[PDB]
Design a protein around this ligand. Structure first.
Ligand SMILES: CC(C)(COP(=O)(O)OP(=O)(O)OC[C@H]1O[C@@H](n2cnc3c(N)ncnc32)[C@H](O)[C@@H]1OP(=O)(O)O)[C@@H](O)C(=O)NCCC(=O)NCCS
Ligand SMILES: CC(C)(COP(=O)(O)OP(=O)(O)OC[C@H]1O[C@@H](n2cnc3c(N)ncnc32)[C@H](O)[C@@H]1OP(=O)(O)O)[C@@H](O)C(=O)NCCC(=O)NCCS
Lengths: 183, 187
């Protein structure tokens, strides 16, 4: 079920059709930053996430900081029987990199997955080539679970492997603690 | 990317698209094999089968009935399509116990892999099973798939226990050697 997540001027709100033109314009200005992701520069990647939201299979979000739309992120790949999900499909306008915005977003999202939704597992994933997102996943305290070969494309169409990580419900108290103490 | 509902065949073996008509018969057979199926979540209830047909109605699965001449002997599936690649998983396989150790599992994956790589032009086929499911890990190892990771709290077993998942793959580059080995094991 759709949620708005907020801390002060930071709002994560369900993605809507009206957000798409601006996200595509914002992604063009960040074209090079988005090089390890396939889709975010095209409307179909956003429309796909809203299709899935309708089918109860994703919760995509618009990231707003004050008045300004600064990116997007998503819960998806639900495993209802566990429950489990993945958090990802995140990009942020590059003025926000290094700011702590990503850590805060991930803290609000994990806190929802574990404290409210009762997830037993949360997966995070990124391209083998994406050294920045890897560092950022590390900093969360997610543990690497695997390397999936020939599992993705980069923005220019090149094939890449995926690094897969997770946080389990047992690890979450210490993950929560560690993040909160970095604020 | 549009995988269509194909029949695969080798001699008296056919893999034919699963239909609703198959499900009563599959459910009774799985019940007969209840304990062999204990590492899988759901194959003894009709809903597991309709869920696959529903996914198929969406272009998200290709569920299959396994037949030896006219005998129904189990089920298997292509699913988790990654259209941009293209890639999929081959899985959700169970055979009747009389066929355990007959080489039927291997011939089934051989037909499926040939179709994935040779017809659908996939760059990756994934296989996965419970961390507890040693026999399946053996058959996967035997196919020539390389283990890629262990995913924690990633599944439930037949009685609802949480288990991890071992994840494997065969890439398009490994396929020829895998094919060669499979072909040699049959012949
Ligand atoms: C992935 C993303 C959301 C992470 O947010 P971020 O604010 O940049 O992340 P952080 O700065 O908090 O963490 C990145 C860490 O990796 C390290 N790092 C940054 N660039 C690096 C590089 N090229 N090589 C190795 N390490 C690098 C940094 O040192 C930093 O850690 P530090 O604080 O100890 O120095 C963001 O960078 C982004 O939107 N990228 C563009 C789109 C994308 O690739 N999406 C991610 C796919 S999941
Ligand atoms: C999984 C299944 C389809 C495999 O077919 P199979 O005929 O049983 O497999 P094979 O005999 O070809 O391979 C089993 C391999 O596991 C290993 N092995 C055999 N028995 C084992 C055991 N009980 N414990 C650990 N390893 C074992 C060996 O490598 C063996 O190969 P071998 O012929 O060299 O001895 C079948 O067991 C089945 O339908 N099981 C129930 C459903 C299920 O668990 N689904 C699998 C989901 S991926």
């Amino acid at each position: 079920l759709p949620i708005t997540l907020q801390r002060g001027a930071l709002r994560l709100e369900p993605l809507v059709e009206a957000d798409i033109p601006e996200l595509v314009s914002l992604a063009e200005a960040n074209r090079e930053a988005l090089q390890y992701m396939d889709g975010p520069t095209r409307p179909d990647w956003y429309r796909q996430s809203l299709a899935e939201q309708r089918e109860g299979r994703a919760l995509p979000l618009a990231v707003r900081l004050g008045v300004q739309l600064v990116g997007t992120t998503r819960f998806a790949e639900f495993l209802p029987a566990l429950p489990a999900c993945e958090i990802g499909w995140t990009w942020l306008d590059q003025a926000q990199h290094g700011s702590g915005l990503n850590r805060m977003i991930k803290y609000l999202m994990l806190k929802h997955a574990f404290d409210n939704l009762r997830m037993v597992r949360v997966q995070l994933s990124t391209a083998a080539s994406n050294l920045r997102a890897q560092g950022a996943i590390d900093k969360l305290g997610a543990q690497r679970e695997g390397v999936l070969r020939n599992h993705r494309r980069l923005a220019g169409g090149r094939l890449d492997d995926t690094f897969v990580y997770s946080i389990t419900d047992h690890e979450w108290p210490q993950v929560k603690a560690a993040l909160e103490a970095s604020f």
